Nucleic acid binder design. Sequence first.
RNA 1: UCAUC
Length: 89
Amino acid sequence: VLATKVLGTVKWFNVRNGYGFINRNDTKEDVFVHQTAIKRNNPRKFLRSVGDGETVEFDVVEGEKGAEATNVTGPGGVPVKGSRYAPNR
RNA sequence: UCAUC
């Protein structure tokens, strides 16, 4: 873990490919986010996702190809909103 | 991992 409970804005997230990027609000740098790194998914949606432009809170770790987000939630640990491309329950 | 579901 390189940083804990960092706030960020999802740059974009591709539901079909299962990944995207988050822009850190502190450093304004992008970090990779994989679908499996989402800790609190939207219980009202199917599939694992975050939605473009959403505010998220996460840890930062060193990944294979640059820094990565893990333990992704909404701010204060609440569920994420998820992607418009992820179907609703 | 910069995609364009």
